[PDB]
Automatic annotation (TrEMBL), chain A:
Localization (cell): Host Golgi apparatus, Host trans-Golgi network; Host cell membrane; Host cytoplasm; Host endoplasmic reticulum
Protein name: Structural polyprotein
Gene expressing this chain: SP
Source superkingdom: Viruses
Stretch of the intact protein here: 908 to 956 of 1248
Protein function: Acts as a viroporin that participates in virus glycoprotein processing and transport to the plasma membrane, cell permeabilization and budding of viral particles. Disrupts the calcium homeostasis of the cell, probably at the endoplasmic reticulum level. This leads to cytoplasmic calcium elevation. Because of its lipophilic properties, the 6K protein is postulated to influence the selection of lipids that interact with the transmembrane domains of the glycoproteins, which, in turn, affects the deformability of the bilayer required for the extreme curvature that occurs as budding proceeds.
Self-association state and partner proteins as the record states: Interacts with spike glycoprotein E1. Processing of the precursor of protein E3/E2 into E2 and E3 results in a heterodimer of the spike glycoproteins E2 and E1. Spike at virion surface are constituted of a trimer of E2-E1 heterodimers. Interacts with 6K protein. Interacts with host MXRA8; this interaction mediates virus entry. The interaction involves 2 adjacent E2-E1 heterodimers.
From TrEMBL, chain E:
Full-protein residues shown: 859 to 907 of 1248
Biological role stated in the UniProt entry: Acts as a viroporin that participates in virus glycoprotein processing and transport to the plasma membrane, cell permeabilization and budding of viral particles. Disrupts the calcium homeostasis of the cell, probably at the endoplasmic reticulum level. This leads to cytoplasmic calcium elevation. Because of its lipophilic properties, the 6K protein is postulated to influence the selection of lipids that interact with the transmembrane domains of the glycoproteins, which, in turn, affects the deformability of the bilayer required for the extreme curvature that occurs as budding proceeds. Provides the signal sequence for the translocation of the precursor of protein E3/E2 to the host endoplasmic reticulum. Furin-cleaved E3 remains associated with spike glycoprotein E1 and mediates pH protection of the latter during the transport via the secretory pathway. After virion release from the host cell, the assembly protein E3 is gradually released in the extracellular space.
Quaternary structure (record): Interacts with spike glycoprotein E1. Processing of the precursor of protein E3/E2 into E2 and E3 results in a heterodimer of the spike glycoproteins E2 and E1. Spike at virion surface are constituted of a trimer of E2-E1 heterodimers. Interacts with 6K protein. Interacts with host MXRA8; this interaction mediates virus entry. The interaction involves 2 adjacent E2-E1 heterodimers.
Organism: Chikungunya virus (CHIKV)
Source domain of life: Viruses
Subcellular location: Host Golgi apparatus, Host trans-Golgi network; Host cell membrane; Host cytoplasm; Host endoplasmic reticulum
Name of the protein in its database record: Structural polyprotein
């Protein structure tokens, strides 16, 4: 005459706060670059988009 | 892998390990893993328990030093170096007796 | 206690302890009143990523 | 009686592994492994001495 | 089979070593700078780099 | 945010490689994590009564140990509780005190990870019998007139969490380097650099500004996190904040450099 | 598999086991089984001895 009831669910893990995989929908981009120029007998560094 | 371990008079276990792939070479065609009661006999290199070698020398040299600062201690801006009966070279960027080898505190 | 004129195999009895709480596990049966009960403990040894 | 090690001493060197992932300094550092023997027995060189007081 | 002999490396502080050729088979040498080794009792020496 | 330990003000010209000397001798994070929870206590006595007796390092203890005796004559002569580290007892016991063991003792403790040390002085005069054996205070330490041929105890009652047995190397050093421009507030300075004792390095801001501002490869191994800024751009002038945190030792240092960058005229 | 065991004040050995396939993930291309004296350093998740969650 006895009976058993069981139930369960699923939740996020605290480990998610440290390890995980992230999906993005990146579409476009911007360009930045570094140049070295010989000016007046010396190498000079420049950075620009 | 290959590890070694031992127990100290400190009642402590000190262990070390190195990854060393140990693969006994299969001697003969029959790849056997434990030698039999009955079977053929073939030559094979091995070692021996003799304790008297013939011109296989390894050099031994005077240890350079062991720089440990436990001997030091700050006494109101006055460093105290304790020797407890050894030969200790102290050297400090501080002026005065910057450098010196002594055997006394 | 004593119950006279009855077989021992007639029935069963259980000691009802409710003094020191027991932390939930699937194996242990539930107390049969509801799902949760007061009393919570944190799990130690957290996670972090380091170089190896 | 094969007594040539009067002035020898043990090491206390950086062993690659003192256990549990981190590498520390132990007296049982090893740096040479010989396995040329066909039989399979191996010589193991070890930092510290043995068989003496 | 051959045995590789590598004697104790030469360490130095506030000064530099030098390679002197050895008439030995496949003998090789090298030098490095900025190394700050540590031993059991602490740093070997003070010269940081 | 971190308690101040040194305030610095500097000024230079644009196009110069400046260096800020944010260093801490306590930041010598050994390569070695394990066994750095270990601390070493010991007792060393100098028999100044003789005046020529080299200070006898009687015995010592590490985390999880016993009395280890430097001398066999001390073996069967000294005891230190195996739980000294756990309860901080760090107290010596000598079974067979005599005139030979009369002198000034010192109970010393060193912490490997924090590099911190403690010590307490004791005096042990020797009496032939208990007709005058008693405790008193000379003025700086405690002096015991030990009854010869009897067991005596020297206490070491330091009970600081620092020395209590523990796994303390779970903690590791952290370094924050930020710049507060002329108009930014402290703790609102842009997070220029984050460093962790495990070699993790994080940089922010524009991609380029990161390279000029750099830290030596192995600052943690030396405890010197001096920050080098190469060919100072005059826009970099401001208050540079260097926060060094490691909580077990209690280290929460702040260093500040007021760097004003000029230009040639 | 994975078993645990302990010795009682009853001077009895109580042991349990579960079949749990424990496979350390190969970090990096070089499938290494014991970390080296010399080599590169890469990030990796792990635990810590802190006792306050
Ligand atoms: C701690 C570390 O060195 N790197 C990252 C950290 O930047 C990040 O915040 C965390 C999860 O957010 O995962 C880890
Ligand atoms: C000194 C201290 O703080 N605690 C105890 C002390 O009460 C005890 O008498 C001694 C050995 O008997 O060991 C230590
Ligand atoms: C510029 O870079 C080259 C690249 O090797 C180098 O040889 C030279 O010394 C640098 N400086 C100059 C050209 O002024």
């Amino acid at each position: 005459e006895n009976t058993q009831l069981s139930e369960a669910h699923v939740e996020k893990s605290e480990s998610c706060k440290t390890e995980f995989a992230s999906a993005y929908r990146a579409h476009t981009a911007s360009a930045s670059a570094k140049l070295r120029v010989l000016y007046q007998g010396n190498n000079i560094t420049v950075a620009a988009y | 892998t290959l590890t070694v371990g031992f127990t100290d008079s400190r009642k402590i276990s000190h262990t070390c390990t190195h990854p060393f792939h140990h693969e006994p070479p299969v001697i003969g065609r029959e790849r056997f893993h434990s030698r039999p009661q009955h079977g053929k006999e073939l030559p094979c290199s091995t070692y021996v328990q003799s304790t008297a070698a013939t011109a296989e020398e390894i050099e031994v040299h005077m240890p350079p030093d062991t720089p440990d600062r436990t001997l030091m201690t700050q006494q109101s801006g006055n460093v105290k170096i304790t020797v407890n009966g050894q030969t200790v070279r102290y050297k400090c960027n501080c002026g005065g007796s910057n450098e010196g080898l002594t055997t006394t505190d | 206690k004593v119950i006279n004129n009855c077989k021992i195999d007639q029935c069963h009895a259980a000691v009802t302890n409710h003094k020191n709480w027991q932390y939930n596990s699937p194996l242990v049966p539930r107390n049969a009143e509801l799902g949760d009960r007061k009393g919570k403990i944190h799990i130690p040894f957290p996670l972090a990523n380091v170089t190896c | 009686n094969f007594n040539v090690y009067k002035a020898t001493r043990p090491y206390l060197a950086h062993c690659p592994d003192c256990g549990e992932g981190h590498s520390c300094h132990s007296p049982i550092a090893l740096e040479r492994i010989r396995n040329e023997a066909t039989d399979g027995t191996l010589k193991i060189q070890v930092s510290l001495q043995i068989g003496i007081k | 089979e051959y045995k590789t002999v590598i004697p104790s490396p030469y360490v130095k502080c506030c000064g530099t070593a030098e390679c002197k050729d050895k008439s030995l088979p496949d003998y090789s040498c090298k030098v490095f700078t900025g190394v700050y080794p540590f031993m059991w009792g602490g740093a070997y020496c003070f010269c940081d780099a | 945010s971190s308690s101040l330990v040194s305030e610095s003000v500097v000024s230079l010209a644009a196009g110069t490689q400046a260096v800020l000397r944010c260093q801490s001798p306590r930041m010598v994070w050994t390569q070695d994590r394990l066994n750095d929870r270990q601390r070493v206590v010991h007792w060393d006595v100098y028999s100044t009564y003789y005046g020529d007796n080299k200070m006898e390092r009687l015995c010592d203890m590490y985390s999880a140990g016993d009395q280890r005796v430097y001398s066999s004559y001390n073996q069967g002569r000294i005891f230190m509780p195996q739980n000294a580290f756990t309860d901080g007892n760090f107290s010596l016991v000598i079974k067979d005190v005599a005139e030979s063991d009369g002198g000034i003792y010192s109970c010393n403790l060193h912490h490997h990870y924090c590099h911190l040390y403690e010590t307490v002085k004791i005096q042990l005069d020797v009496t032939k019998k208990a007709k005058a054996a008693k405790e008193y205070w000379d003025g700086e330490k405690a002096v015991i007139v030990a009854l010869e041929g009897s067991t005596v105890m020297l206490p070491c009652v330091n009970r600081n969490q620092i020395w209590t047995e523990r796994h303390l190397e779970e903690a590791q050093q952290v370094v924050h380097w930020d710049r507060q421009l002329p108009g930014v507030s402290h703790d609102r300075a842009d997070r220029l650099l984050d460093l962790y004792a495990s070699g993790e390095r994080r940089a922010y801001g524009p991609p380029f500004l990161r390279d000029r501002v750099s830290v030596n490869t192995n600052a943690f191994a030396r405890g010197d996190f001096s920050l080098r800024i190469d060919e100072l751009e005059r826009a970099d002038e401001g208050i540079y904040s260097c926060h060094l945190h490691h909580h077990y030792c209690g280290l929460h240092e702040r260093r500040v450099f007021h760097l004003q960058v000029t230009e040639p005229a």
